[PDB]
Amino acid sequence: LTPAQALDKLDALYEQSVVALRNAIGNYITSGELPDENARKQGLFVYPSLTVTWDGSTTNPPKTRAFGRFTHAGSYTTTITRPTLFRSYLNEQLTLLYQDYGAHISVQPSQHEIPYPYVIDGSELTLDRSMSAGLTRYFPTTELFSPLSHFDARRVDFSLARLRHYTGTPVEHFQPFVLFTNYTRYVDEFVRWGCSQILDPDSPYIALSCAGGNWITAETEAPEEAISDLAWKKHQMPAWHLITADGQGITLVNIGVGPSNAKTICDHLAVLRPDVWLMIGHCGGLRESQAIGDYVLAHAYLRDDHVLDAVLPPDIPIPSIAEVQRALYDATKLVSGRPGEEVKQRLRTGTVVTTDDRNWELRYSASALRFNLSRAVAIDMESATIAAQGYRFRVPYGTLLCVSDKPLHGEIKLPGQANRFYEGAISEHLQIGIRAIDLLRAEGDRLHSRKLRTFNEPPFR
Amino acid sequence: LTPAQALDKLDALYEQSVVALRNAIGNYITSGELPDENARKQGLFVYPSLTVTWDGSTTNPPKTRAFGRFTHAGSYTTTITRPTLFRSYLNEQLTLLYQDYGAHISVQPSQHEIPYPYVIDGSELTLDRSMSAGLTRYFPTTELFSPLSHFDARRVDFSLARLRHYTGTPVEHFQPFVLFTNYTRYVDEFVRWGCSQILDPDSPYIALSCAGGNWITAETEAPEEAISDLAWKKHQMPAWHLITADGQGITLVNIGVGPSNAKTICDHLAVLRPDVWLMIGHCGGLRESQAIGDYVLAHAYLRDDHVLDAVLPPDIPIPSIAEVQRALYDATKLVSGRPGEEVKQRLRTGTVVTTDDRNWELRYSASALRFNLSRAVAIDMESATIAAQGYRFRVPYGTLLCVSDKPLHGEIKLPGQANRFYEGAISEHLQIGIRAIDLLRAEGDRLHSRKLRTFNEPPFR
Amino acid sequence: LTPAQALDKLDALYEQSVVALRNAIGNYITSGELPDENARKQGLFVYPSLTVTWDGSTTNPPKTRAFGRFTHAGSYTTTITRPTLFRSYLNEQLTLLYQDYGAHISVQPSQHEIPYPYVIDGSELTLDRSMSAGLTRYFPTTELFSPLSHFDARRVDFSLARLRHYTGTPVEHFQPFVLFTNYTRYVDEFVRWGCSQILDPDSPYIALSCAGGNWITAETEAPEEAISDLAWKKHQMPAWHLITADGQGITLVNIGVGPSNAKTICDHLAVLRPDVWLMIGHCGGLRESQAIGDYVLAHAYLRDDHVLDAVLPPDIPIPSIAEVQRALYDATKLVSGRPGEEVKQRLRTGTVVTTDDRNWELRYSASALRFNLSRAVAIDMESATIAAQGYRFRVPYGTLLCVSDKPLHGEIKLPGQANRFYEGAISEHLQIGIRAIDLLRAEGDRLHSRKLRTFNEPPFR
């Protein structure tokens, strides 16, 4: 079986099962009819399954490439979902393993049923007690030789549902390059620059999906509902996507403050397999020489976030992705005016402490030791978590914070309070992040390295 | 008081006390005479003391520079030893604080006596029980307003004695750029290249200090005792210095194998305030695609060495020094350069696991999890220790290992055993290290950054 | 099957497989021929397997003996290697279980192939890239109901190779009684006393195997290459065997300094199933009343070596072997001249602290508490490791250190420096170790006790 072919068989098998499940649900709701256990065991409500086999015999196997490689010979499989949504990714990936390795592709019904909630489109069914009990009782509900991809169908549906809920946006609009912010003013500045881009006929940005629903295009009357206020009330982590024809835009998610959110948003965004995600937010400057408005390029993290300790012990080193670091560094040179070495007065490269204690100041003495020991340069509440998650899910990551205050030097400022020097910097900061993406986007495929690969790294990126 | 002046008063005061102490000892040995408690309280056997004061008022204080800065106004002091040995360092450092900050320098007897063992140039004499007891009883011995430098006189004398004992070399010969190796063949290759350098009249290298005593210069008859075999029996960590007129050569220490030595050697070498130290050694390749002879540039370390856990918890991040990484990376291109390929096929940048268990293979299953979790790319026994020490003592550091075998893929070769492809890579490997040093040396003062500075970082480099 | 019989069938089966594997390798090198998967599944490249069954019915089973016993009835098996090398051991052991328990012995091809590296005699092969790839690809490589012995064939071959590499000696020359030293001068003193023994026609010592290769016998011209200097450069842990006709001589290994080495050397030496290994080295005296040159008999260890914490938690008690303690104690009386209770002025029995931090002095305050809490009497860097390994591998062990300095009382000397008093004790010290061995050797089989036996202790010693 070939790429284009496999994609089509996946599409078919999928549509078939979702349509089939919707039907069964309809019948149970109208007449009270149940599906016959026989047709189900035949793959009635089942996700398509994708398997790629490799004999292990290839003259010059790519051993330098980051993704799309085989560690050993054998069969790699996985359940698939939303083939249409992942069409590009699935194609691009199957193609690599098909040519460079000459692999055997095969599509066929799996043994996993699509939980009914993931096939119900419009609005949640609002049946009564008995109706519901009957549904979760007689229908596929959600439950708690080698992997072809990082996540299986159920894991992906679970996260696609969450991404939409948390984001107030359709997962089809998400772009490959993500920016995470911990301050409301960043989306304001982003939407503005965005709308602006849409109008300029030279900019590739042709649309702007907004948290809440609004879809803004070149010809939209009064582009003011771009930042509907009802969004921050309805969605915990509003997103805004600046789409381009080829889907190479920039997605911005305002994750809010805290490691919980940083963790959560990444758990789900990961399934979309982003090309990179950057942390563009404010932080506390811990060094006396630092000035509000200065930038901090994280090169290491002191993980005081707790949120990921179980799955990734604190003694496991989270490195920096050289490519991403260059991008952030160069972007700070270009965007911060002074072209050259004078950046060292505005930019500081160092270790950032990420904490889950918003009132850490109340316990400075107790933290002081580690702050010094780690040679901490700034303190925030999302960085390390974003990095760790990027690391865990093989998504290139980077952190470029902006000093919004100096907790240790009498200047404790809060986000939102009058702070001309920070506030003044917000637009430039967002531009540094955007320029960094431009640089990385230009670096084409060179972006991904092998610093995130595991021994049992799946063939798919 | 000025730089040149301070240096001279330090020299004077020092020589005075050592001569005074040697005298007192001689008198006690010949007649049995003791020194008068009065002259001692007057600074008879005392190290010179160096104090530098800063009012805190300077128009444009250097706030970007890594070393030679003042965090606050006040008086910084420290005991001094071997002013002649540190003449250059002391001058260069006092000069900075004298001009850029206009500081008040003052030299005067301290309250610390020079332990008699540090003034006795000759090893052992012939003292019997009583004689000794008398010495340690009536003379000064080692007993176990802000810091001007990282180490005080006693700490420095302690380490200088050790450096010499372990190295089989005079501390005066040590050069600013250090190379650490874990394999005997590296010194062979180094001494060869060195002697060769000496002969070439264009090479800055004019002398080669050898572990054991041998001093080789342009006009030396039969330069064969360069690598005296008795050296590896007499010294645990033989060193070889390739001196240049201006003392900017390359020092190579063969630290042997194990974290204990790596830690120990750095504890002492740190007082000489090197400009950088690189780990040039062999390692095991943990990845399938790696080939014996390939290089590994460490960008993070999984610390399984235990040796530094107490003073530097495993959860404190040890970053990479961007400058050092570039140097190592570019040097690999230049020295390994092959028209028709990317270095990415010979060089791998990743996380290295440093262990204190030579037979870790006997416990693979138990380690496997962390290896994977850390995305380990190679395993050695010195890297992390060297890096952590560099980090702790503010000495730029870097690691560029050479795959000597693949433990996880049927090729468990040992250093010494036949290894067609490793042994054949050793000379090129050492050259990559040497080239990296050249690049860093050229980068002049730009080499030191602020990634190793603490909040209470001492004025001196 | 009987003892002598089993031995011969093991010899046969073994030689056959090694010869068979050598052949296959030769054919692959000359023509490119591969072995037929069929003959291999028939035990072509397989280690002999030894199985001993016991019905559990014996009138008066030895329940006091330390080794050669059955905890339960059933079948005990194990792969065998180098039957000729272990001829004596294997015989002595099978004989016990054959008579005292009347067991059913059976020898036959196992399911484990001998990794090709272990059959290649001369030097490690040095073929090119493809050749090698082909070898590790098509040939047996080293991959990482009840046990008859402590180690299986593969584990034993692994260690025999290491023992030779580290020791610079053939495993055949290793003697039952081992002495470990951490100071070069001890081997000097040993080789001397050894060459002397060889000449005296009453001494059982007839040969001296030397690290590096030298074989010295009664009639050897100029016995000066006994301590070839090139040894300490080629071998990390040089050994010297003083062989006797009946192979009951004394083996001395200079393990160097550090817990890593101590651990490593024991991991391998253990497969030769020594009768006992003693730690004969220098240490720091922590008690004011101690004098340089005094002896320390360890009766407990404060394990600060980290190196074995995983396999043997620090809270697991490592006891003293009464027999070995007496031997060390009595030997100190005899060799140290004045016996009776006077020994109490030269010998101190107490708890020793073994650390992996050579510069523990720089952190005395942090250690002081535990030193006191453990009533520490001396500090070294190998003891506990050697002891623990002895404990782990059921090899009787003991520690008799010699105070080379007093860190806490002014004299912080260095074994390798001018220490008139320590240097003078060295020869006597080595003799105490040698005498202790003589005493234990005389104690015949009574030497082994049950303090090292586990619940699932293997039948073989």
UniProtKB/Swiss-Prot annotation, chains A, B, C:
What NCBIfam families does the record point to? Answer: AMP-nucleosdse, PRK08292.1
GO BP annotations of the record are: AMP salvage; nucleoside metabolic process
What Gene Ontology cellular-component terms does the record carry? cytosol
Bilayer-crossing regions: none
Give the protein's biological function. Answer: Catalyzes the hydrolysis of the N-glycosidic bond of AMP to form adenine and ribose 5-phosphate. Involved in regulation of AMP concentrations.
The name this protein carries in UniProt is AMP nucleosidase
Keywords for the protein's UniProt record, in alphabetical order: Hydrolase
Q: What PANTHER family does the database record attribute to this sequence?
A: AMP NUCLEOSIDASE, URIDINE PHOSPHORYLASE
Return the SUPFAM superfamilies for the record: Purine and uridine phosphorylases
Give the species this sequence originates from. Answer: Escherichia coli O157:H7
Hey, which family's this protein in?
Answer: Belongs to the AMP nucleosidase family.
MF annotations from Gene Ontology: AMP nucleosidase activity
